[PDB]
Nucleic acid binder design. Structure first.
Lengths: 82, 522, 75, 99, 77, 70, 73, 92, 135, 36
RNA sequence: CUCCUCAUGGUCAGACUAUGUAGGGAAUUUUUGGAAU
């Protein structure tokens, strides 16, 4: 498995932000992250490239479609320094 | 300007000489030397047989590379002798460029005579096989008495330390010799060449030793053929088996032949088995047979090696087809096809038309233009059409005509003793009548890519296709126009049995004449 | 090959957004290792106002490689 | 065989890599990964106005093509893997030869 | 609540006319009957028609092997 | 890539956006984790502080050595 | 089941045309062979761009990944 | 055995065009995804259609403030990725 | 220098730099000279010395030192284990090598490296050609 | 050394009573003199 | 150089780590492109 996959699994239960290949940003609490980067998310606030913002309850996006994630700074401590 | 580089070196007064050259071009070089036009001539090792009398001789390098050995090896003092016979004066002058390690060896054995020895101890297995097959040696006593005639015997007495016999004495000689011959016999009985039973003692010969000894193929080569060849074997496997032999030790390689073999392998119909070694001469034999089947433009270096291979293969391929017959596999058909391909130089499926001497792409197309498939349609053709098809020189036309003439349209007919009374496990004799188009003046086989001369022969084949079982085979030399031949062959088990007879020539492809018939055995 | 854990979404009405700015709504029916989805009562939401009922009971299949994201309409 | 190995041979070579995005790269290959990820040093890079960069690592799939020096010996570099495979793959009568 | 390969198989048996949405192309969609498919979702489609939306016209294509990578959304009509 | 660890690196994305951050770890897919990562778009203009980010290896074009580690 | 691979095998030695995903190019020619990954080889090929004949290319190789579909003509 | 089957399938498949190109040292023209074309001789190839090409002449089309113009350049030693290949044409 | 001693006082270290650059030269020369002379006692020892100048170690330091990948703890353990080298070379089973080198870790690596160390099954059959010449 | 114990044997050239092979302890003590 | 697979030697209660004449890194979530304009 990937070390960043391992971190991303640690990120479960936290509030993360996600940018997809389309450019829409989904901020919310990450329920579940599979090995394939498929992520289940809660109470998501979404900002579109046009600037419009919406709210949704439960969202699940495919791994392949995710440009990148931003995860909280708490995890930066360890154990990935090694 | 044949020998594409022989021009520029020879133009400045240094000639080139090597085996495989265009002969005219070589002869021009030699004439220049005799007339004094070229004062210097560079001769490769293998051409020591071409004796160009010189006033002086230089020998540059005593080391020649062979791949098989995987290192340079110094020349035989024999080669050097044949290399010093060329020069005589005003004073005979011989320069030999040598190492320090080889100095004491050449400086002695050239000036002082050559001590002669005997290498029989290596070939004893094959030699004793041959004697047993000829049945002159009935027993082991007989063989020892036969070894009394050897130059080996005298030699082991005068210099026993060279052959590893520690005891020097009449009794010691006798014991050591009997040890050697005993070891030989164990290898032969284990390899099924012979059989030994107590009653002095009785030794008998099996089907393997028969053919091996008759064709003269070495014991080890035969043992390798036995180990690899089984039923349901393919043509590629048969060809590999052919390539792995001891007869090819005499095919030289320096580093370029092997690298070029790698580069050549892109262009070839087959692909060497992965679990054997590429550098071994076997791989080279394999690819040069590929280059014989597909007519590549070969370097003149490889032409010689191809020629050597061809000088070996015909006995070997005969052994390959016959050993499968002895093991009773109907796949000997494929071995026969391969033998045909070796005599001719073309594949079975690729094209029958290319078999006729001196055909190339363009000329083959005219055959497709007249919609000819087999060769037998060329025999029915008349002169005007032939002239239209081939516009070429007269010698080539003549060889084609000879090919057409001696390639018979022969018909396959059988006459069975009793079709009603058919008993299982009995020796059932059939009389096959064979008849030929034209009665031969001589049996010469004609092929361009196989320089050596061949006499035509035929194989009569009986077997059943589904079971892949070959029931009977016989070889015949048909000198007359019409003959009869009697196959004494045991019948199969009870019930309905398909029996298909082939008449397959050893030389010419697409000669396969078949008749299928089925009998109900009780 | 991993199987997506979609079991929580089974028999739920979801809005899939898909490549080319396409959006469809339907009840999640099947899925596979490939994320390929079967949707029943599928309704295409075209660019303007109308939606078409493409598959009411006949359902439909969407390639998981074409699936951008999936929203759960229910809880 | 695998051309990526041929790229592996290309360390310390000065090359100009055109990329799928149209970007031009000029530099000395320090290494190429089997992914065809190419790490280079002393690189001038022109996006479709050159930026000078000490080291650049490029993901292999982004590489469109790599233009090699004309001095390179392709005959020698192409034939390796076959020889390596042959190396991985790899009686009385021995001396045909005498005295 | 059935796997998509089984769904495609019932399209196969029923021989219903099938409309495929292609990838990143809204303009055209392909239509026809599924006579067979493989593991890569390549489909042999009979009496296929190209349907440009941009009233709709179309080009009759006859028998077709459509590659599965284009497939966005398989449907019935 | 292991030498680049802990360094400040500049990654160029597929869309042309420029990300800059400390390279803490990588993987086979070249998915990178970047600490204290900020985004620049046009060249400073349109710079944003993202924080700790993963980036996908499918999106990454190239990376260059920006500054020394903290 | 009649699979795309057998249909394509039966399509070998027949005049075909292949529309690529771009639709910027169609190729009409005899289908010589196709491999297990479905790359295409055509002979006597002709190129139709925008539905008009661009030119006669001849023996041509089509990368599998570009193929939208193949039809028999 | 598996290796043998792969090489053979390669020989009788569509790959035969690039195999024939390497053996005959014949020029082929490659339509690429950049809308550029490469007419060259095939020095080496790969299953991915990665290629070593010699005597490369690449031709492209450019638009300006007037009539479209074709542009071309010579690259003697060129190595090419396998995905940029749209089409490989072999011709006289 | 053979024993790998870097020094604090650098006068000695400068002299030993000189010996570093020219030592393998001089020793190798002496070896070639003895080889020309045909002397048995010096030539073998000189060959060992030349090897020691080249690879910087003694005979009693195990040849595993000149492998780049062989670790430090292992070579220390073998130096201290007082065991003939032939035995380690004869050992085949990798687990058994790890047990013999008494560290379970790295044993497989060590065995791999052994099969990468030169090992020769050598035979010779002499035989006279004539009374004076011996092949 | 073992006063009753088995050993394999071979033909060869014997070494000096004080020879590098017979004095291994000295090299570890020699390098151990400077240490590390 | 990297990841996986496999083999392996070890350790722990499948995981981790060194090594490997090993296999590999083109068919949906990453490296053999849906991009091009």
């Amino acid at each position: 498995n990937g070390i960043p996959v391992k971190l991303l699994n640690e990120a479960q239960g936290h509030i993360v932000s996600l940018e997809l290949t389309t450019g829409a940003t989904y901020r919310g609490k990450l329920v579940e992250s599979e090995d394939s980067m498929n992520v289940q998310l809660r109470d998501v606030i979404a900002t579109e490239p046009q600037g419009a913002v919406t709210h949704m309850d439960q969202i699940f996006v495919r791994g392949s479609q995710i440009k990148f994630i931003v995860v909280p700074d708490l995890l930066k401590n360890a154990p990935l320094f090694k | 300007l044949t020998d594409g580089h022989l021009r520029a070196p020879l133009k400045h007064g240094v000639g080139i000489l090597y085996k495989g050259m265009a002969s005219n071009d070589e002869r021009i070089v030699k004439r220049l030397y005799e007339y004094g036009a070229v004062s210097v001539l560079l001769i490769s090792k293998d051409c020591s047989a071409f004796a160009c009398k010189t006033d002086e001789v230089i020998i540059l390098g005593t080391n020649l590379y062979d791949g098989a050995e995987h290192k340079y090896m110094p020349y035989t003092i024999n080669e050097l002798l044949e290399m010093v016979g060329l020069a005589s004066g005003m004073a005979g002058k011989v320069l030999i460029l040598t190492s320090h390690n080889m100095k004491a060896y050449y400086k002695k054995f050239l000036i002082e005579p050559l001590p002669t020895e005997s290498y029989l101890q290596y070939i004893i297995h094959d030699t004793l096989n041959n004697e047993i097959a000829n049945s002159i040696i009935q027993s082991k006593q007989d063989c020892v008495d036969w070894f009394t005639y050897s130059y080996f015997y005298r030699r082991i007495h005068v210099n026993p330390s060279y052959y590893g016999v520690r005891d020097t004495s009449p009794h010691g000689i006798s014991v050591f010799l009997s040890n050697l011959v005993e070891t030989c016999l164990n290898d032969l009985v284990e390899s099924s060449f012979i059989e030994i039973d107590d009653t002095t003692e009785i030794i008998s010969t099996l089907s393997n030793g028969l053919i091996a000894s008759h064709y003269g193929v070495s014991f080890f080569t035969i043992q390798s053929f036995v180990s690899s060849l089984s039923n349901t074997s393919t043509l590629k496997n048969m060809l590999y088996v052919l390539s792995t032999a001891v007869e090819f030790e005499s095919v030289p390689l320096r580093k370029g032949d092997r690298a070029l073999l790698v580069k050549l392998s892109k262009r070839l119909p087959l692909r060497f088995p992965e679990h054997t070694s590429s550098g071994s001469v076997s791989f080279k034999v394999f690819l040069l047979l590929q280059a014989y089947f597909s007519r590549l433009e070969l370097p003149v270096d490889f032409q010689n090696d191809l020629k050597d291979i061809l000088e070996k293969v015909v006995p070997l391929i005969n052994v390959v087809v016959d050993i499968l017959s002895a093991n009773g596999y109907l796949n000997a058909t494929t071995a026969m096809d391969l033998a045909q391909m070796l005599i001719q130089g073309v594949w079975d499926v690729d094209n029958p038309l290319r078999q006729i001497p001196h055909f190339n792409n363009k000329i083959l197309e005219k055959c497709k233009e007249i919609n000819v498939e087999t060769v037998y349609d060329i025999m029915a053709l008349e002169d005007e059409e032939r002239d239209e098809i081939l516009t070429l020189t007269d010698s080539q036309l003549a060889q084609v005509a000879a090919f057409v003439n001696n390639y018979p349209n022969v018909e396959l007919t059988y006459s069975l003793n009793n079709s009603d009374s058919l008993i299982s496990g009995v020796k059932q004799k059939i009389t096959i009548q064979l008849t030929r188009d034209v009665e031969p003046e001589n049996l010469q086989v004609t092929s361009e890519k196989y320089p050596f001369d061949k006499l035509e022969s035929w194989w009569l084949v009986l077997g059943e296709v589904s079971k892949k079982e070959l029931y009977a085979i016989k070889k015949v030399t048909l000198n007359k126009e019409t003959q009869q031949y009697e196959l004494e062959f045991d019948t199969p088990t009870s019930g309905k049995h398909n029996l298909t007879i082939w008449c397959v020539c050893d030389s010419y492809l697409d000669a396969d004449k078949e008749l299928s018939f089925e009998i109900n055995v009780k | 090959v991993s199987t997506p854990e979609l079991k929580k979404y089974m028999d739920k009405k979801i809005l899939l957004n898909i490549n080319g700015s396409r959006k469809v709504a339907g009840i999640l029916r099947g899925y596979d290792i490939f994320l390929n989805v079967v949707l029943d009562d599928a309704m295409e939401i075209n660019g303007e106002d109308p939606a078409n009922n493409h598959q009411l009971g006949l359902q439909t299949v969407i390639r998981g490689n074409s699936i951008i994201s999936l929203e759960a309409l229910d809880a | 065989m695998k051309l990526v190995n041929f790229l592996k041979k290309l360390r310390n070579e000065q090359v100009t890599i055109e990329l799928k995005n149209g970007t031009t790269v000029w530099g000395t290959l320090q290494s190429v990964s089997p992914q065809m990820n190419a790490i280079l040093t002393d690189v001038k890079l022109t996006l479709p106005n050159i930026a000078s960069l000490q080291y650049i690592n490029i993901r292999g799939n982004t590489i469109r093509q790599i233009i090699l020096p004309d001095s390179l010996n392709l005959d020698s570099l192409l034939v390796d893997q076959k020889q390596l495979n042959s190396l991985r793959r790899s009686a009385n009568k021995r001396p045909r030869r005498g005295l | 609540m059935v796997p998509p390969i089984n769904c495609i198989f019932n399209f196969l048996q029923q021989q219903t006319p099938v409309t495929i949405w292609l990838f990143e192309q809204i303009g055209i969609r392909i239509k026809g009957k599924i006579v067979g498919f493989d593991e890569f979702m390549n489909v042999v489609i009979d009496e296929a028609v190209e349907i440009p939306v941009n009233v709709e016209k179309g080009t009759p294509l006859g028998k077709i092997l459509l590659k599965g990578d284009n497939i966005t959304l398989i449907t019935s009509a | 890539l292991a030498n680049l660890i802990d360094y400040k690196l500049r990654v160029l994305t597929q869309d042309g956006r420029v990300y800059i951050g400390q390279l803490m770890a990588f993987d086979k897919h070249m998915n990178l984790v970047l600490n204290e990562c900020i985004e620049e778009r046009v060249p400073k203009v349109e710079k944003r502080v993202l924080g700790l980010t993963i980036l996908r290896g499918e999106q990454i074009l190239s990376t260059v050595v920006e500054d020394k580690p903290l | 089941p009649v699979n795309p691979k057998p249909f394509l095998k039966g399509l070998v030695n027949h005049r075909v045309g292949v529309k690529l995903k771009f639709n910027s190019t169609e190729y009409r020619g005899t289908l010589v062979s196709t491999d297990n990954y479905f790359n295409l080889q055509l002979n006597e090929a002709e190129e139709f761009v925008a539905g008009v004949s661009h030119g006669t290319l001849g023996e041509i190789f089509i990368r599998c990944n570009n193929v939208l579909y193949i039809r028999e003509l | 055995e598996l290796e043998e089957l792969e090489e053979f399938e390669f020989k009788h498949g569509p790959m035969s065009l690039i195999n024939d190109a390497m053996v005959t040292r014949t020029p082929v023209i490659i339509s690429l995804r950049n809308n550029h074309k490469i007419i060259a001789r095939v020095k080496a190839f790969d299953r991915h259609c990665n290629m070593v090409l010699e005597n490369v002449k690449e031709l492209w089309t450019e638009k300006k403030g007037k009539n479209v113009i074709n542009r071309e350049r010579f690259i003697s030693k060129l190595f090419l990725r396998g995905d940029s290949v749209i089409v490989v044409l072999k011709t006289p | 220098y053979f024993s790998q001693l870097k020094f604090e006082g650098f006068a000695l270290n400068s002299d030993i730099v000189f010996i570093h650059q020219n030592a393998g030269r001089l020793l190798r020369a002496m070896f070639e000279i003895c080889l020309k002379r045909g002397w048995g006692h010096p030539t073998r020892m000189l060959l060992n010395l030349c090897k020691s100048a080249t690879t910087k170690m003694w005979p009693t330091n195990c040849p595993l030192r000149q492998f780049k990948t062989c670790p430090v703890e292992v070579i220390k353990r073998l130096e201290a284990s007082t065991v003939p080298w032939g035995d380690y070379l004869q050992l085949e089973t990798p687990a058994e090598v790890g047990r013999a080198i008494r560290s379970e870790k790295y044993g497989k690596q060590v065995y791999d490296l052994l099969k990468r160390f030169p090992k020769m099954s050598v035979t010779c059959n002499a035989q006279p050609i004539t009374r004076s010449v011996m092949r | 050394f073992n006063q009753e114990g088995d050993y394999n044997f071979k033909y060869g050239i014997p070494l000096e009573f004080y020879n590098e092979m017979h004095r291994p302890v000295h090299f570890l003590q020699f390098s151990e003199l400077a240490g590390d």
